[model samples]
Target: SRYKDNRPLNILGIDISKMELGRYNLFEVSIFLQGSYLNPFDPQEIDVEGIFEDQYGNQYRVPGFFYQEYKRELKNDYEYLVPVGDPYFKIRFSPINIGSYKFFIKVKDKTGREVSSDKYTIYVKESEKPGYIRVSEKNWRYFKFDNGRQFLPIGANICWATSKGTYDYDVWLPKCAENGGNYFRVWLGPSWATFALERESVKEYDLKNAWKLDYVLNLAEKLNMYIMFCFDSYNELRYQKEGAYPYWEHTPHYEKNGGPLKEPKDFWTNNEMIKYYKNKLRYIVARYGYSTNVFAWEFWNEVDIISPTAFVIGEVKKWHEDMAKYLNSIDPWKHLITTSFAFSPGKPEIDSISGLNFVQTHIYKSNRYIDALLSLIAYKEKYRKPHLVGEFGLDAGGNDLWVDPNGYVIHNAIWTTILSGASGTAMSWWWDNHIHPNNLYFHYRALADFVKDINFLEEKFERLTNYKFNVYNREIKVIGLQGKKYILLWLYNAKEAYQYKKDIPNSSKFLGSIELLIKPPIKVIYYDTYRGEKIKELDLDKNVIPIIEFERDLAIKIELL
Candidate 1:
């Protein structure tokens, strides 16, 4: 039964626990294999797949991946994954149809060895899950669920976990989701909870990290939240230079670490490195591409600042194009794809790539408030793709707790971006340090509540400039979007803005008139931005609301009756 060295290309057995699977739900098939493979992650060594045929004469070749089972263990106040059993190969698929399908496990090795299992049947039942997220077809500037409901991401970034590992998301994600947040971002770089692949081992991913990612993705599905799984970051490319993070030595791309590349910049053009990178991409897609909650696959975080001195824009853009094309080719689900920049406007060379589904920008300090609007406008007008402030903060140096401890910056960022017709709320960056500690989830709750009923696809909004407001000659700003039958507006006193944090608090109150250029027979409802509740409702006989006094800021929703 066994060949030389007690290892041969053989299929020991197959296990399918659920004969009746739910539509749009995970249907995993475990396959036990015995093969002489030094690296199971490389398809050339040992490749496996699940060939399935639906009742409607459709065939799918879903790739199988090596899996390792692990259990979380707490020792010396630090949590780690303890190996539970031996490794095996598995295929995870989400059936989109209700009918059952015939499937079989297929295995192949580089030695011309091949094996297949007997045909099996499984019935797919109906489920209520919102299948997957896609860029809205009607409005390319926003996202819509598979069920045709508009999706507005109303959460912040929970990039990496603390010492708690998966327990960090157990605390953070639920709180964010419960408070009207349906989306969040996580990284797979070399860090705590987000870390997936080992830095020095390009052929094999860390099994424990894989297990933790599986846990989070399943948890997100349960909580009904979408996740943007970032693949890499600038830290991996930066060597020990002046004012750099210096993590290049830890990356497998560096030749000193027994990898292929001699320098970080070589990552863009090295043949061996690109091959290894594609292997990693295939493993990731085969492993986690089944989940509907996997909203997008981001290539990098602030790629513009990846390297300090020898930053090449053309090289990076070409790399994104090639990788994105390869990723799209293998991924059966075709999830959204995006990348980020460190400054206001993202690079046109990368954003204009046809493979990139959307664009993102990160802003901090100085013009953080101004850039949130400007960047959104630029991307929307130039590329006409869904754009979001992927990350924003009062200061890039720190969490800005010393300046705006009351979360004024966080509040203004979300309200300003969403009201100005950005695809989603301006996602804050300080999740653990500021937002959670200061209990600022209420800001998301307020924005989420305001736009709960407004469907971006049906509304077809445009910038509304026919609004005027004056607060006793004090500087004030207004932003609104005018739909066919509805008007959404946000007015705030400039003195209380985040950009003017050093200004003394002006408690003075004054009555003001908001001249809205719209027809009559309308109803106006004013909302308290801080409380996330309606202040008052009035029937408007004309196109103006008068005698309204407020301290900081307010939101108005006008509906044509």
Candidate 2:
């Protein structure tokens, strides 16, 4: 009697449970053991094996291993089980250094009898590209770019693209490309409950919409942009609500607040949840890790915001370590990894999450720009990880009280932070009805372009630690950059009215070719932040040096060849 076959086996849905392609010599063949298996199979001893033939007519039997299964009862009174069956096997034969060959796989049952699994064929070719990109002690410790030609990373944050979707790459990527932005940060938020699930639960959860992250990735590829993909924003809180509290209780957020704000009776960090998250991370890496567009995997955005207690320090560090290990296990690629901290810098709790690829911090001090820069410098010295000012921008909205006073003050702060060795600066502004049209947007673009134009200005200068200047009596001042190749001089006079002080020390006179110095080498090209025209070559003499004047404490950047 033939039973109605309502559901067909998803034979085409073959998945590689595990694959280990080992090292091989130039002409020596390397076999890749692919643990391929069919999903949703019944509880039965399923056998798997394969055969491979080389160009020289040599045939070999592929080795096989049984798949491991783990099962548990769920809260819904349902028995959740996964099948453990030996999936697929492979046998690789070495060919001449430059040639391509085809191979196929065949499966069989426990009795050494042939099974009906489809034949799988794959072609192998030899080349320079590594079969896998691994992050070891040497590659993971330091970052080198352009084949180790360029070291410093000058970039920007791309948070808006992921969250608001207003700054779509179509509109903003070109701008970033024109401004020479190589790196951008993006976030992965929990729009729906797609992240917390087991294999079966994930299939039941209908999360197709949540997985469509290709929109940003495609745009990034078009613009040649590298991304720092951050996982869910403030997911620790969500994790706590889902009975994952032990992990939370150990976190800064829960430890400081006494305990979980609200605990679910069914919440548990048992082997079930661990397995679920591991599977989820594996799926994520298999999907996006191969793309060169990704620069790093950010564990969390502002992870410290939810955790501030000292007791959770160890947990924070453990969380980062575990996450890094999990990501590396699945991808093995040397992708940079780091979690972002809130405003505080020196807190031990924050430092506990270190061992990552780089360090990042946010700066929002309205009047403490110097303190912010100094704190970042201290972190850089301590961790030796490349650092960036992730978020900082001055808002001069009409209703904000600090508008008038902070307008110029924020500009001064930006100049100082960039000069102090920040990888890049992000200008923050709220979307006015999803449109960036005002003085704020213009200012943001101006500042972005200014930093972009000065290719040598990103991470070139060693901070002038002991330099002294008298801003009170002098309207303009000069500072040297690694000899006389470049001069970083600025106008420090904040007087409401313009006043010309005579014979300000001609620092350029001490250097060669004083006549080559220009009054303002780079100027604000448009009506935006740092708006001035750049005069390429200027005839600087004793008379021309003192007479250079400008309104406000506008900065002048002089580049010497």
Candidate 3:
């Protein structure tokens, strides 16, 4: 008896009745609806909650994820469009105990009418794995598992959905898993986003797209890959005029869609849209916050692209500050929060906003490898927070994907970022064409194998640049870092992927008689990055000038013996 007048809450059959989950895997159950109820997409809405009980008699009360739908678009190759579909509702949760589990759902509509469903059961199995990721409080520059294991996210960006409007996660994610990559970035653009805003009929939530995201998140759990899920990008409202690919009018926030807002600044100032946006934030944390695969939630792809942002940048700062605080309020797991910008766009420190877990940036240039190293140094010195490259590639506006099936740019980018002391490898952007098709994931496999057993948390590495290099008559560049007990060197031939035309790194300017000067009292292990195997390991010191040779690239690890 909540309100005097109300609309009855009705529940159709549950689409997913049973769930069999592995230790860290995620699961969701969809429910059909028939009622005048406000979807989770509303500023002010209905309420749904459940009792998730395990065989141990532990009862966890959780809320349900209301649904919304969206329209999608595809271009160039036999272009087509996808229309919004009917509405539905669902509840999502993760199981911790390894045994029999059950749950029940109760819904209270906007009219105050309520309904309940009979108890449903599922099963879970235990496995040896981390439940989630946490920033290393000790190092502040790397990541470790909640269970105390090291996690190095090494991979590329994957932002497209299946066909056009639908999410096709199964296609590329498996490829990454098979090849040894365990990280990726998926941007929820207007076309096939995590949230949906339908324009065709029901001005309310459609429920399809939210579940569309469910598939990918579930996929990530099984694959053991961590996703830096980018929730928003500036592909909506007023400022679309600045870029060639404009979709401002197509957004739900636009005035034509029975919505109450327009313009980038409007999103910051208007109370109505702010409620809508903030509500969506709460819905995401409530719906999907249980898993450990999501590494971070990026607020905007390149915040500067928002109108008046370049001119009045302070406002963008306020926007991020507010949104991040709101997200923190709702997220039970308190996942890492982050936002990114173009390489040099209004550079913000890791401490610029107190709520963020780390600082992230992106760049698209042929050869700025050294610059990335410097950026990491600057951020670490200034903010004392983890720094990462969220995206990178050959050029900003380009046709050819930065394809380096060999260990050229893609391989070099991975080790360079790691050797430079960033949180993980630089996340490459041409995933669909370059990474997926060319089987570039082995780059990560090789890198993971190379650094697999070493506990980075124990070694607080400092960049060591003043090193003597001996290359046999060729332009060889060397980059390295030193820890309390160990030192590392990444040597490359001057002729890199950037030097040659796109596609294959068919050319190699490998040099010989390679040697470096180092103090004694250490054992040196040189790895052939391409072969993913140890080339040689020797006991050397001050009296011993560590001598090793390679072609395109090689990684040398010096452990104090």
Candidate 4:
């Protein structure tokens, strides 16, 4: 927009832009077109209809405009459109097979005359590793890399940074990586933004925030970390709190900001509000959808909280379906897209949204918290897709900061959830406070080492419970992931009770020995969970042969011939 007070762009032609991105990656190319668009915030403010077609005639379409990229980050929220406003329309996609990949920009002008621009080129470079995560068709319970390596996500909700303008990510993300962790989530709300969420309009956005994001993405990729790029966070998008609304009060979507949203509930029903949401997605993809470091795209941090109970339900469904379609259309990499709910599997609408790649839920250490993480395995089986426990707490009350300080909850969550066949480790929500300060980062390294060199693609493991324990006066909790000739097992210190699932010891516990019944040809390797080392490896010729013993906790890989 050239004029003051935000006027039309009157785009004349493309600038013959150039970008360099890694191969098997995505990059954005915005073209300048001529026009006078007034509202520009509508879903379709202006239309410069055309797609990016490379030589040999492979084609990629212009998903949307810059104004559409103007998004919301209400410091928290589940979370656009067009116009002839400017020469700011962009096309996003990847260039494959390296070298100088060139293309032409063709679009219809305001006068309905077909406009053409000079040739543009993108230089694609070779990438040394596989970048994104996708559901393994061999087992929907886990994820795999584009290069066919099995991925076991091991990290927590280290969302954004530890404090204002002070990113602990450079310290912790690399720490997690060196210690065998690979995944984390970043949240975008009004209060947590790299770009100015309060920039007034879509085209008015400053890419300075994007520069910050670019650094994170490039760093994660080089370090082999996968990121969950979350676009919405609750309490920020809506007036969902009591007494005060720190995050939502200053949001551009609120009525006080000349925006159309009446309240939190209006987010889905209000047309103008929906456009704002769409614009952000378009903007994000236009800018950063190029990286392979991103594991998934979270539509919202806790989307279900945005609506009230028994309110018109169809509108929520309507909102997701449309935005999901927008993301599906725009993201060239097709990274996994999801929306998290505080009350997961809440509305039937959550299960039916086909545009979503998988289903995710959050759990707190409240009633039956053990069942909470364990049940998601069944959740995956029922949904017939990948399932994830995106968030968990040290306690149900959201506090108990003293609880799990010894890293018991963190330990149990990692072992039980992964053993139950989740796509990744159960991500705890206590990063900055509990995990970091307590040095629980070691817990991830322990789990990561336990699954070291596991090639999930080569075997199909099934959940099994056919084994029995032969011990007296002790309670043992046994869980197994069994394949045709092998079983992965864990035997906890006997007895079943509700308390202290968090009582998971941070070190070895000498719980005597438990004899196992198994196939004839097999070997057992006991691991030191705390140190991530092999305690002992024993070969057993007979089926019911040996007693497996280790301290604190025990995990063994039983190989079958």
Candidate 5:
């Protein structure tokens, strides 16, 4: 009888909001339980799981997590979490098939004592919702949904929330979606908005932060937008360095903060610290991994900035390999895994890891489009994986707002990267300041409308380099991707629009003729890139296109006849 010491094994009841659900829709199971545990977030203390069995005997075991209900309310002009109900255990799952399934809950304590609930049945109905995103089967460079619809990420970075809290996303997500933008990246390591495990003991997390992220991810699903969840920042490992942002004093993994690591470098090789990180990963996957709107799990944002020394880079690469493998094992959904480098030579050792699904680059203060395209090509050739310019801007110090208020950099980056054979459009970094304020969301609308009918995944598009435009007495730059039967091209005035500068009003027309190294007769349709509409169409008896005139930029689609 002494073995029954106030343990949390009594399951009172189960709550199912619906007996039937749509395919690819979220299904929540709430279990009322009586339990006592030192660390609810640690599985070694108390572990919860849901076992789902389909009609064909296919089974899925998903980890359940401890959750507390809290409502966001305004407290003296600041948003705060207001507790709504007592804490409980919840398991969320998304079914992939339209059939009947039976599921049961299992709870286990460190003493190996187990309790399971009776199996319950539910039916899955047909839904128009698209399936989860994955790397294209036919083409390795692009992404496609489970329903076979191609996806092009055409948005920017909405990294953190403002003082407006969830209200900021309520406005920003809708604007992006309304303008045909369907992708964004957010950092889960920011103290103001996220950072669930900031300074707390590794065994505990801030549910309030997790709840706010839940709100954002749920909102993204409602608006048909995808999110890249970045889990860590280089600043988390930076001590009181003169040139870097210092956050080590506040990180939960620092030794002074009751963690096991003696220094920042110890974070990469310390076994105890690695175990603690795995615990955090488990909690993350248990909660958000069930949501299909989650696009990719980025390990870090420019982790190479942690140090320039060769030894640190080696340790960091090994740490990434180990952590990425662990994350892939726990996550049943197997979302794409990626990490980024800032101005590093692509970190070939880390990029070559098989566990990483994609590779990314972050560039600043350069020819945004040109640099992005070249980097994309290098990653594709070197790694043979999907590549993207995850972050780019006119400047790194938030100066793009005043220099290019009209969003010319935003407009050019999106157009150039997509046509130059990147998996996704180049995502600019000035979201709240330059993009939203100057109404640059329309820039995404143009690219979306232009590529709506085209399937880059199936077409097997490759960068077209053997092309030139003869502009009258002026330099013109061109970038394009050519498929087997079609070609997408963009031409810009190098002096006027290629660089990061203010938008001008001079209408200096460049009369040009386009020539490509192809032998087929073609029909070309010129598009108004900004308006997302067709301007005119022309038929050519040869591969040469003549008598084309444009001012700042021109986009065209070609068909072989």
Candidate 6:
């Protein structure tokens, strides 16, 4: 009897249920078979074979005979009886050897008919140092390298650097390190231009001239700086032009008619497109996946620009998931995975993607700045992913329409986010035009140093807690953390009225005199982040509330007795 041919057949369902690898990792795969015709033949005649591929493209195949003791038996009234028992099959691959590998299972019926399961990718990373892979008890998110030694990643964004011969690693390397920047972001694929054709021709130039990533990787290692490597930039246009095929295309910015156009229809669902991206992932992981200077592998840069295209949110999410799987298989231990958004906070997209290590957002406007930060914190808390203000900072001359009047709104935003528990901040101005010495660079370096000075271990502050004290006509907003011996307070918009309220005992019941356990004598040290100087210090009353003045967009850490 012929069953419904239209119904999809569960040809070869292989589940890599469990995998464990140390020196020699073992893989246990479970195979399932379901078809319209089954009862006519006993399941005992089935055969299966497993094949695995290493980063070098070496293939290993192992054959297996079906064992009834391991088959999963299920009774069905129709034509097929679901096979029962553990169809447990084990394959031993050599030491992963610090790279990504793919494993696949193929199943065959007694007649020699066969079907293969989707390939599964696994990563093997060198064993990490003891404390290097610490997980927070409050949040399972992992932090690596230097054991969370708070270092400000002061660097610039390389958004449009993918232009032919425009990727400058030499000029920006020393300048960033000398300016106290320990990190920077680099793009992998072209966003607006096509350089894939020039790849072969550019290989002859010096390291700076080649489009290959080897030079950038070496430069970053030499400078001892971390890189946030983006695999691709805007996808909307890329998908529109290429669809699938080779996964990248060469198309002019405009059509001959001088009219806007929609992207090709098959861009998102094309399997070849997935394979193309997978190849890119394999290349990166095989080459620089072992480097410590490479901080995180961003699946794509500003992917949201394609939200309106045929590559809908779900498809985009699938792309990121597949990319994550590929990266994990290749570099497993060395790199983190993330993607950047435009000005919007990483939300709806974050909800759809997993295996993400951090939530990144770009803040371009001052009004929406605080909200953007808060949104990132919310995602971090909910998803247990570290949050980063990936792209922020104002344009030079404070002339951009988006720039805030204080010229330090970006500074304010950074301090607020860090105090609220963000992993790091990426200054966006250093590479806005080109790597030139300017106010943007100086302020960025200063901010980075400011973050490096604060000892997170000694301070436990809940940035959201609010303590408002009204004194006369002025009011002060403060967030405080109480140590065993002293209370650390972050004053925002401290006013004279706050001091007056402190003087009047009953006027402000919240204001109290307590012993401050400072290193020696309790004193307030005012730090001007912009000027990168300790402007002043005043002897603490040690009896009344200590008041410190900080200009807007500045952060001051008060050490009490």
Q: For all the candidates, what are their Cα RMSDs to the real structure?
A: 2.9, 11.8, 5.1, 5.9, 2.9, 16.5
How many clashes (backbone N, Cα, C below 3 Å) per candidate? 0, 7, 8, 34, 1, 16
Query: Candidate 6, TM-score vs. the true structure?
Result: 0.60
Q: Residue by residue across 1-561, what tens digits does model 2's lDDT show?
A: 011112222223344322222122111122222222232121112233334444565554433322222332233432233334432222222222223233444444323344334444433455332222112222232345422322233344546443223234456656655554556666554333222212123211112222324455656666666777776454444444334222443322232433223431111232433443454455445345545566677766666555233225566566567767767654534466777765547344545454576677666554545455656655665665556556554332332233432334434544555555554443333323221232333333445555444444232455444344423344343222322334443334434312223221121121111122333433221112345334333433231233133444433344442
lDDT of 6 by residue, 438-491 (tens): 334555566666556555544553453433343343344543444433344444
Q: Point out the worst 10-residue segment of candidate 2 by lDDT.
A: 504-513
Ranking by lDDT: 1, 5, 3, 4, 6, 2
Off by over 4 Å in 3: 1-6, 10-40, 51-61, 67-88, 95-106, 113-126, 162-168, 192-206, 238-240, 309-311, 349-351, 399-407, 470-472, 495-498, 501-519, 541-547
* Residue lDDT tens for model 1, 275-304: 888888888889998899899999888888
Q: Which segments of model 6 are wrong by more than 4 Å?
A: 1-142, 146-152, 160-168, 191-212, 235-265, 332-334, 349-352, 375-380, 393-407, 429-437, 457-460, 470-523, 538-545, 548-553
Error of 4 at 100 (Å): 6.3
Q: After superposition, how far is residue 116 of candidate 6 from its true place, in Å?
A: 28
1-561 per-residue lDDT for model 5 (tens digits) = 111225656788889868899998999999877665567777877788999887888888889888889888866656688888877888998888889999999988767778999989999999988888888888877877889898788899998877767777888899999999899998877343353444365547777778888999999999999999998777777666535675777777777878787777787888887877888888888889988899999988888776442137678888888899899888877888999887635788889999898888777755545655666565566677777779878778877788788888877778877887778888999788778888888778888988888878767688887886676787777778888878888888788775545453331333778888776778888887777778788888888875356667878899877
Best by lDDT: 1
Query: How do the predictions measure up, each by TM-score?
Result: 0.95, 0.58, 0.82, 0.82, 0.94, 0.60
For model 2, the local distance difference test gives 0.41
TM-score, prediction 1: 0.95
* TM-score of predicted structure 4: 0.82
**Model 1: per-residue Cα lDDT at residue 211:** 88
RMSD (CA, angstroms), candidate 2: 11.8
| The 10-residue segment with the lowest total lDDT in model 5 | 501-510
TM-score: model 3 vs. ground truth? 0.82
